[PDB]
Paper text:
PUF proteins, named for PUM (Pumilio) and FBF (fem-3 binding factor), are an exemplary system for understanding the divergence of RNA recognition within eukaryotic RNA-binding protein families. Eight PUM repeats are arranged in a crescent shape with the RNA bound on the concave face of the protein. Each repeat contributes a trio of amino acid residues, termed a tripartite recognition motif (TRM), that directly contact the opposing RNA base. FBF recognizes a 9-nt motif, 5´-UGURNNAUA-3´, whereas PUF-8 binds an 8-nt sequence, 5´-UGUANAUA-3´.
Residue numbers in the entry: 168 to 569
The structure:
Amino acid sequence: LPTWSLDSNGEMRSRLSLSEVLDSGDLMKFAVDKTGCQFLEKAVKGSLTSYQKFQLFEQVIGRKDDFLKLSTNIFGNYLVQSVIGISLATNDDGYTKRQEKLKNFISSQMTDMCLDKFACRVIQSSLQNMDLSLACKLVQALPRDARLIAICVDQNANHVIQKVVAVIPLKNWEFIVDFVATPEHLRQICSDKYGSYVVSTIIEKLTADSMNVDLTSAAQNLRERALQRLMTSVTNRCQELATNEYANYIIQHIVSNDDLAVYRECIIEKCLMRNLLSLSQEKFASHVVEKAFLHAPLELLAEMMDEIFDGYIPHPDTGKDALDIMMFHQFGNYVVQCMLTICCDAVSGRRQTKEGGYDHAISFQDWLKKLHSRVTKERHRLSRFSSGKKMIETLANLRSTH
RNA sequence: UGUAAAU
């Protein structure tokens, strides 16, 4: 901080004016100081004259090096977002020029600004507040090589990608979807704490749900094409995504969403079917199996139930079947529990048994009787476990009301 | 008895 701005104690004087700081040439010193930046942040919220704006624009977003220094500063990045705000609100000669100079500045340092904890906020800010056409150009400056992977898995830059997906039309970031759907990129990105969220956010935006009813038919066709490209790669690696600690949320999201029903059905038929006993014993994939049971259309649900009740050869030495294994397994027990809940919801009217006017109630009753007969015969061993007690108590409650 | 984001 420059000595002319301090008092008898080395403290910043009160009663300082904005134009004093602007005229002094020491704005950069105030902007990286906590107290000075607080003053500037508050001062620029007032009624500024045209010349005060002129000085602000030139000293904060006028020169690349000072812009970058402020954008990557723990305090300056806030002043940068404020000045960009004022710039967007000031409809003078320079309105588009300032945006383009700003777009060019960020474009030239795009990777490093995304990876920076503070500059990545300046980027997200510009993406959603700048004129859409300039914001779209900013998206094009994203790298196309291994840096884009590093961006998706970064603790800070992953939010830049999610911001792009939220506020930019799909045409401008289609290359990200094709990048992500590249098989080797997909595995790295989905299997990461941050990148998993990136892929889920992409899929959500690519879904024709109620939040996309405002799209044109032409935008829906483009959306559907990107969705199919991404879904093809995902379903091709579905088993390894379903069993990964971070990617399993992606399979769950596809399976649980009615507006992705055809992709749900393809995952169930091509990935989980004939693997239910194995995947039910997996820490992460057992969550995927539950969602499949909960959301499967009735014909696939019947096939999944029949795979558990009668798809596996009993153990040759003891005669234990798949149900025996799963009911006592550390993860499989939640799947049986889910199966029991579905059947009880059906008989008790809390679940639709008609699918297209055709009633499958008889089938739910069949599955419930199988679960009840097993639980009744194994009640003593099952009473030793919480999951077992839960099943026993769910059953007794049910037929004392029906 | 069972898992996830940065001023």
